[PDB]
Structure formats: C-alpha cells, structure tokens
Design an enzyme around this catalytic site. Structure first.
Site, short mmCIF file in Angstrom:
data_model
loop_
_atom_site.label_atom_id
_atom_site.label_comp_id
_atom_site.label_asym_id
_atom_site.label_seq_id
_atom_site.Cartn_x
_atom_site.Cartn_y
_atom_site.Cartn_z
N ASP A 195 0.84 -1.19 0.00
CA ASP A 195 0.00 0.00 0.00
C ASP A 195 0.88 1.25 0.00
O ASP A 195 1.36 1.67 1.06
CB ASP A 195 -0.89 -0.01 1.23
CG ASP A 195 -1.80 1.19 1.30
OD1 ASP A 195 -1.91 1.91 0.29
OD2 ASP A 195 -2.42 1.39 2.37
N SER B 110 -0.51 15.53 -12.08
CA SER B 110 -0.74 15.16 -13.46
C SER B 110 -0.98 16.42 -14.28
O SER B 110 -1.51 17.42 -13.79
CB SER B 110 -1.93 14.22 -13.53
OG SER B 110 -2.33 13.97 -14.87
#
Length: 330
Positions: free
Chosen positions: A35, A199
């Site tokens: 994770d 992004s």
C-alpha cells in the site's frame, strides 16, 4: 541488494493485489497488500480477536526465534474506506522477494474491522508511503522500504500491476525489460506523507487532451481512480446510460456498454488506461448495472491514482534524497 516479488489480484476484478512476505524465523509467509498510500506493516496474528479472523493466515510471534516485543508500542490506523485495525508491535526479520530487513516493526493486530475479517485473501498490509505517516506510538517506526533503502543497489521500488493478471514489485532496481519507451519522472511532494504528484491533464477516449493540473497520490492500496467531479463527469458523459447513483455510491453504467479509454498526463507523456480497466462489473450478482472504475474524489479531499491508473503503467517510486515518481507505458 535487490528484491523481486510477484503480486497477484485477489479476485477477478483486481479489487486488490497480494504479495507474499516472509516474517520471522523460521519464515511465516503471509500475503500482504502493498500500500503506497500508508506506512504501517500490520498483520493478522495469534493476538487478533478470534471472532475477527476468518480464513486469513496469521503471524505467531511466539513461534519466531527472532521476534521481540517492542515494549510499550501500540498502533491504530483508519483508512479512507472507513476500515481500521490496531494492536501492539514486534520487531522481526521480514523478507520480500529475497530482500531481507532485520528489526522491521511488524504491527500485530489485536482488532480489525469487519471489512478486513470478511476478506480472507489479505493477511495484512505493507505500507510504502513515507514513514512520517506510521502510526506506532510512542516511537514512530520506519517502513520496510525505508529500512531497506540504504542497502539497496538504488533507492527505489517499482510497481508493475497486472490487469486481470499477476504483476511485480521490485526493490532496488529498475527492470528495463518491463516497460516500453522511456520513463517520465515527475516531482513529488512529501508534505502529506504520500507519493503526491501533479498530473498535467487528461483525455477521454479519442478526444483532445485537456491540459490541467491534477494533484493526487499514487496509491497501490486504492482500487479505483478518484478524480475531480468535472473530470469524472466528462468521462461518464461519453457512456450512454451512465449516471451517478447516490444509492450505489458512485457512477454506474450499463453492463452492455463498451467503455472509452482514459488518458492521464505525466509531464509531456501520456498514460492510456484502456476502457476495459474501468469496468468493475455488476453492482450486485446478476445485475445489468456495472460499477465504474473512475469515481469522483469530491468527498475524499484528495485525488487518488489507484490501481485502475497505476496498472496501466510501470511506476517508479524513487526514494532518493529528493523523491520523484516515474511512469512508463508497458
């Protein structure tokens, strides 16, 4: 040193991925959910409330000659999906894919919430976010990667998750045969303890690319792709009959649909998520309403590049003094 371990989807939907991890002496092999959105290595154990164990493999520290109670240490964690677990702490030897750390904090669960009990395939979590998020008190503990870093050939790990197939976590090296083209690296903020990056935009299907900054986290422990409501609406508007369902808890779409791809930007590069990766199947057995793999982050407080996005790429988690993220197509 290096390590290399195969990671395997837990079910036919890629709801999560499990990676075998050796703990203790002799080794006890548990299948952990790696994770990159959390920082605790915790396991089902001989200390877990018996009624909360249903098929998981447990760590038994009393059977490990290298286990030592970390005296006074406790932990307690709550995840974004509302699940939680807590317990006490041992140090022990932990190996992943041939890479060994001695003295790793292994957090033994005394209690786990129902969603953990109900998932017999996940024996615990291995956190790979920054150690500043580790919950052990009163002495915060380091992640497996942080402990291994100095020994690694290069201070990196890579995630290469499969679509409906196994993939690979590598530690200490970048497998140049595992991706196509070049790796595009992008800046990371560690201020929230995550692999947080920006992004450069998105496209839906064959549509034009929209240049827009989307701050979010690379999170292997989250199944889906969670993005701003504007972006998610633009995606689902291209699917006839798709709608946001408050009763189901997100966007659903007719199972008869063919989904468009979704592209996200990494600098000037582009990662394309095929439409099929966005299909999470019937909302309930036999239903013709299917659950979408791109969902709004509006109720979260952070955008999350979960498995739906990451499995479309070869992803480098660069833990150099200034961390960065790398993405390549594959």
């Amino acid at each position: 040193s290096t390590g290399s371990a195969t990671t395997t989807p837990i079910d036919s939907l890629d709801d999560a991925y499990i990676t075998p991890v050796q703990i203790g002496t002799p080794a006890q092999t548990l299948n952990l959910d790696f994770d990159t959105g959390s920082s605790d290595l915790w396991v089902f154990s001989s200390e877990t409330t018996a009624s909360e164990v249903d098929g998981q493999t447990i760590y038994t520290p009393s059977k490990s000659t290298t286990a030592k109670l970390l005296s006074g240490a406790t932990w307690s964690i709550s995840y974004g999906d509302g699940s939680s677990s807590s317990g006490d702490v041992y140090t022990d030897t932990v190996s992943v894919g041939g890479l060994t750390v001695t003295g790793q904090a292994v957090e033994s669960a005394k209690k786990v919430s129902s969603s953990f009990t109900e998932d017999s395939t996940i024996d615990g979590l291995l956190g790979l976010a920054f150690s500043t998020l580790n919950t052990v008190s009163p002495t915060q503990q380091k992640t497996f990667f942080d402990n291994a870093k100095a020994s690694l050939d290069s201070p990196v790990f890579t995630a290469d998750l499969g679509y409906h197939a196994p993939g690979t976590y590598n530690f200490g090296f970048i497998d140049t045969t595992a991706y196509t083209g070049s790796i595009t690296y992008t800046a990371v903020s560690t201020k929230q303890g995550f692999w947080e990056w920006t992004s450069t935009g998105y496209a839906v299907g064959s549509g034009t690319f929209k240049s827009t900054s989307i701050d979010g986290i690379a999170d292997t422990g989250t199944t889906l792709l969670y993005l701003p409501a504007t972006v998610v609406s633009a995606y689902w508007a291209q699917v006839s009959g798709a709608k946001s369902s408050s009763s189901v808890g997100g966007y659903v779409f007719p199972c008869s649909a063919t989904l468009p791809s979704f592209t996200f930007g990494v600098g000037s590069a582009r990662i394309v998520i095929p439409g099929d990766y966005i299909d999470f199947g019937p909302i309930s057995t036999g239903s013709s309403s299917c659950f979408g793999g791109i969902q709004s982050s509006a109720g979260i407080g952070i955008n999350i590049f979960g498995d739906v996005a990451l499995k479309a790429a070869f992803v480098v988690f660069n833990g150099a003094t200034t961390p960065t993220l790398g993405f390549a197509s594959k």
